[PDB]
Amino acid sequence: SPGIWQLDCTHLEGKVILVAVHVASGYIEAEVIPAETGQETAYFLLKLAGRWPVKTVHTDNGSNFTSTTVKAACWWAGIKQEFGGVIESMNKELKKIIGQVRDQAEHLKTAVQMAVFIHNKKRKGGYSAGERIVDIIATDIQT
């Protein structure tokens, strides 16, 4: 289903990485956030929904979505919670790539975004996740 995204936070070096994955394609978007908070989650959700057609979001930590702030962002953007192996393979893959480029950047946040870039452009055959998301979404638009 083209509008389903998974969102979770992971921890590395005392910092928090918010990782969103488009389930159908494996494409990822991520930000290094200063603290795991409802305000940061909500802002990221609003950003994501203005960039891709987000219809539902699933998470592996349901308590991440209970705050008034996050509920308001889902209300404004028209997102609903998705009620039920791709995601597991994309988050340890992301730490694996982060580990490989970590010494190429001074800051962790730079390495995270290098890892997103490598991830999304990797052809798996056999197109990349970035190629798959735009095909999926463009195909969905044309009826």
Residue 140, marked binder: no
Residue 135, marked binder: no
Q: By the 8 A CB rule, do 32 and 138 touch?
A: no
Residue 40, marked binder: no
> DSSP assignment of 33-93, as one string?
ESS--HHHHHHHHHHHHHHS---EEE-S-GGGG-SHHHHHHHHHHT-EE----HHHHHHHH
- The annotation places the binding site at 8, 60, 88
- The annotation places the binding site for Mg(2+) at 8, 60, 88
